[PDB]
Design a protein around this nucleic acid. Structure first.
Lengths: 83, 138, 99, 150, 208, 125
RNA sequence: AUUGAAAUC
RNA sequence: UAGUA
RNA sequence: GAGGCAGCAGUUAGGAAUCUUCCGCAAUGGGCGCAAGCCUGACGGAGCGACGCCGCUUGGAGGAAGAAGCCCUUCGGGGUGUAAACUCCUGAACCCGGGACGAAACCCCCGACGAGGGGACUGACGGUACCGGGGUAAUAGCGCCGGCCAACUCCGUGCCAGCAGCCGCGGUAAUACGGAGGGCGCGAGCGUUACCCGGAUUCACUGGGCGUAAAGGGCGUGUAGGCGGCCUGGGGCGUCCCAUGUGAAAGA
């Protein structure tokens, strides 16, 4: 089971995540299959969220449960918003 | 027998010029001819021409110097100051077009043999092809 | 692509198998000179169809033995028992080489 | 005008019965910082005159330095006995990067951007001459052009 | 930190008048008016032919000791230059000139870099309104270097602006005197400064 | 050598070796004295130069020099070795660190103080 | 003591 | 015989 | 019979030498669960150690033809030195007030358990960061000064005591030892020792050599191996060119 999820970059008290797909069994900040966005929980840039939303839809299509909070973000950039 | 006909040629030339001979022979090969025309075209030799000496083909190379110079030692400046074989039969040398060297901020030249034929470095850069880095002159 | 090599058969003194000598050449990594180098391969011959001296193509293949990993594709030219001769000499060279 | 930096002084020595006898040696450059330098070697009983002599001899010995913008035309290497020197052209911002000896020649010649290497026997005198003979051997697009024309 | 201790003492030693006290190292004694020779017992003694090293060294000590700066800090900027596009020598000077603690000086809000520093450390200064307290802050073009409207009423700020009331300033610096603010127009060019120092030697000191 | 030669033979990394078997790299080693003597130096020098034999935790036993103007070292002293030769005492290739273990710092020592292991006096304070 | 010593009284 | 030009 | 920290801590031993038996699942991530949740020394944090990098502090402006003290001195003088003392100014530390982002999901309701919309809970770090008010002149050391290499005088000492990276200093005038004054260089560091690259074109591919400096085999024969004259044609293995795929992330 492959997962859309968050990997942690940045520094101490400087969290910066990378929206990644990866086999569930890999380490959090381990190797990943593809980067498909990023996310700054502190919203310090005017651009603190981004998602290749075609790709997001691809990985879902081949089946890849997102972390509950990684799907929250995918929602925010309308990965699931249709019509 | 002779191990490097080309290297021998560059030398014959090198040797003749330092005693300021007006001319040298070098036994003849078409590949030798092709190098000669570069020297010729690029202004290092007055020119070559074919002759048959003692019954066999040579190329008579006509050398080219400077004006009689001023003070003690009036020997002319050489036009060919430095002719040097690069790709010897011992260690063959090949640049691709990216690695073709520019001899002496351009004031030099590097005869260089390609599938488009025997070329100067700028000629070959322009034609976009590398090959056997034959020698260099200046 | 299954790597396809071509060498010389230098032994068929095995059942359904030929030793093939593949020679390779290249710019020496540090010293420039083009050096030659070579490797014998054990190649699979189900019809004992090839013999001493045939120059043969040779293909990367499904394992047949511990060390049989290639099958004999086509034959390029018969004869060439000169190349065979050269391998055989290097061998008995080693004889006059011990203590 | 002519600037003059002294590179080396040394105290040599001969032998006469009962005691040593000294002399002195003077390595001095002179330059206008506009493509004209000279080098001289002065020898004399006392330093001052050795220096002063060096000066005299240096002006008597000057050179063409084709100065394609603070650097030199192309890359010469020159061997003087066991001393080699390599000169390499550099873009501005670099500097005269060399040893005390090649530097103070190159500088007083009106060079500002140059790359060098003392190779082999680094004896200053021999190094010094080499460097001059390197300068003295520099050519330019013009001269080469004149040469090969005919 | 910084330097600490005797300043218009290096006024001397370098042999060229340094302004490190501002007002006095400027007025009939930076001691260069009295004893323009190096300090200590062997001061007014005969110099010797200084070495090609000694020479490059002092020139660096000269340039650095001007701007009041750490060797470790100085040297980072230098290397930080060089690899950066263009003529190393100047650019370095540029970057040195772009230090707040110095702009503040250059822009008249203080009489010395030393005093100018303290104003930065005590937040008396702002860049684009936000209060800055780093003497190292690299001022880029367009930035406005304000006085803290909170600090305006200091006897030191008043008195030191009333002096620049008439005074003209840097061909790369603007200055509104009454609203106590100035501008960083552009990096200076070597010629813009009359720095009593040969930057080419400073390049050489860090080459050997 | 010809290129073929270099191709057959290559070159060879000279890699000359340690001046200090204080073993395992080891920037320092601990040791116990065995013998504290005095040694006549050599070449063109003369003086009664102090030096100890040391039994090493590296399994070794080496003579090490005792710097400083006077010392507190006798037979079973236990000490730290730092390396650095003497030169005038042939065969002495290590120094003793003063101010570590039973080797005291040097008394009344005001100048090069961190070497010789002598703490800052408060006499001018 | 001699020459700074070693030797030597 | 030692250091010492 | 029981056991197996090279999980986190910690103990002990070896060693020149390496941390807290800490807080929290709040975040990210993993397991199980329809869910609520339960588990997680992965983790997220605090602790210790100048071990490293970066920022910052020990003040700022005035202030004598120049206090004293100490150091020289040819006995007039020179130096430490605007340094201090002293006058103004700012106000690291410290006190009070306020006070985070990091956390919106899973979940509930509406809609259809979808899309979309609405609501609720939750912070270890932490009363820390940051903001506002008050406010004290408030830490400096270490190495070096014969040449290389930047910085010199005076005592003490007399091949002694000692120094020394190499060259070398010391035998009664020592810029080299020990000390003081001064000076140079760095600065919360400065030195030392160990190790790696450098310089070293001193294993030389780029880039070295062998008459006397180290270096031609005592001489041949010829094995493998290296190397190969002039002309033409075929093949395209070396070589060269174009396109394309690969060259994960981090790093530069």
């Amino acid at each position: 089971m492959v997962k859309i999820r968050l990997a942690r970059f940045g520094s101490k008290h400087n969290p910066h995540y990378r929206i990644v797909v990866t086999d569930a069994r890999r380490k959090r900040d381990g190797k990943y299959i593809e980067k498909i966005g990023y996310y700054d929980p502190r919203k310090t840039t005017p651009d603190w969220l981004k998602v290749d939303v075609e790709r997001a839809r691809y990985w879902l299509s081949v089946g890849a449960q997102p972390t509950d909070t990684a799907r929250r973000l995918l929602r925010q950039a309308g990965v699931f918003r249709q019509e | 027998m002779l191990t490097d006909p080309i290297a021998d040629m560059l030398t014959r030339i090198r040797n003749a010029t330092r005693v300021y001979k007006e001319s040298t022979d070098v036994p003849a090969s078409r590949f030798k001819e092709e190098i000669l025309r570069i020297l010729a075209r690029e202004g290092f030799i007055k020119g070559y021409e074919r002759v048959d000496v003692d019954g066999k083909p040579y190329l008579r190379v006509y050398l080219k110097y400077g004006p009689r110079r001023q003070g003690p030692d009036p020997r002319p400046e050489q036009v060919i100051h430095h002719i040097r074989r690069i790709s010897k039969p011992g260690r063959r040398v090949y640049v691709g077009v990216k690695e073709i060297p520019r001899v002496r901020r351009g004031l030099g030249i590097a005869i260089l043999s390609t599938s488009k034929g025997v070329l100067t470095d700028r000629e070959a850069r322009k034609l976009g092809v590398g090959g056997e880095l034959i020698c260099e002159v200046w | 692509p299954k790597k396809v090599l071509t060498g010389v058969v230098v032994s068929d003194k095995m059942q359904k198998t030929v030793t093939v000598l593949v020679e390779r050449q290249f710019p020496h990594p540090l010293y420039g000179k083009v050096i030659k180098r070579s490797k014998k391969y054990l190649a699979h011959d189900p019809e004992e169809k090839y013999k001493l001296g045939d120059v043969v193509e040779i293909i990367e293949s499904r394992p047949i033995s511990k060390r049989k990993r290639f099958r004999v594709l086509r034959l390029v030219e018969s004869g060439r028992m000169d190349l065979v001769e050269k391998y055989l000499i290097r061998r008995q060279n080693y004889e006059s080489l011990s203590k | 005008d002519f600037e003059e930096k002294m590179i080396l002084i040394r105290r040599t020595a001969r032998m006469q019965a009962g005691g040593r006898r000294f002399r002195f040696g003077a390595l001095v450059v002179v330059g206008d910082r506009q493509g004209r330098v000279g080098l001289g070697f002065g020898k004399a009983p006392e330093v001052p005159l050795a220096v002063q002599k060096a000066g005299y001899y240096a002006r008597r010995n000057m050179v063409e330095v084709p100065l394609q913008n603070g650097t030199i035309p192309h890359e010469i290497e020159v061997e003087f006995g066991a001393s080699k020197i390599v000169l390499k052209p550099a873009a501005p911002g670099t500097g005269v990067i060399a040893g005390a000896v090649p530097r103070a020649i190159l500088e007083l010649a009106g060079v500002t951007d140059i790359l060098t290497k003392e190779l082999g026997s680094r004896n200053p005198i021999n190094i010094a001459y080499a460097t001059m003979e390197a300068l003295r051997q520099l050519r330019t697009k013009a001269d080469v052009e004149r040469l090969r024309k005919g | 930190g910084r330097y600490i201790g005797p300043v218009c003492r290096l006024c001397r030693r370098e042999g060229v008048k340094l302004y490190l006290k501002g007002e006095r190292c400027y007025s009939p004694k930076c001691a260069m008016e009295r004893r323009p020779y190096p300090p200590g017992q062997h001061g007014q003694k005969r110099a010797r032919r200084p070495s090609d090293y000694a020479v490059r060294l002092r020139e660096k000590q000269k340039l650095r000791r001007i701007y009041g700066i750490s060797e470790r800090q100085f040297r980072n900027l230098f290397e930080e230059a060089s690899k950066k596009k263009g003529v190393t020598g100047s650019v370095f000077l540029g970057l040195l000139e772009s230090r707040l603690d110095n702009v503040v000086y250059r822009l008249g809000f203080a009489v010395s870099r030393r005093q100018a520093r303290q104003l930065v450390r005590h937040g008396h200064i702002t860049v684009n309104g936000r209060r800055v307290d780093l003497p190292s802050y690299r001022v880029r073009p367009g930035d406005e270097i304000a006085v803290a409207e909170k600090s305006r009423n200091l006897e030191l700020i008043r008195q030191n602006l009333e002096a620049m009331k008439g005074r003209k300033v840097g061909p790369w610096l603007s200055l509104d005197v009454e609203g106590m603010k100035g501008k960083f127009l552009r990096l200076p060019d070597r010629e813009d400064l009359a720095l009593p120092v040969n930057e080419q030697l400073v390049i050489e000191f860090y080459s050997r | 050598p010809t290129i073929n030669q270099l191709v057959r033979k290559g070159r060879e990394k000279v890699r000359k070796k340690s001046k200090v078997p204080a073993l395992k790299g080891a920037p320092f080693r601990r040791g116990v004295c065995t013998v504290v003597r005095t040694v006549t130096p050599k070449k063109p020098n003369s003086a009664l130069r102090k030096v100890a034999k040391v039994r090493l935790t590296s399994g070794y036993e080496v003579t090490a020099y005792i710097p400083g103007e006077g010392h507190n070292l006798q037979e079973h002293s236990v000490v730290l070795i730092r390396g650095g030769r003497v030169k005038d005492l042939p065969g002495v290739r290590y120094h003793i660190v003063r101010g570590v273990y039973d080797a005291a710092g040097v008394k009344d020592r005001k100048k090069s103080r961190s070497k010789y292991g002598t703490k800052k006096p408060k006499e001018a304070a």
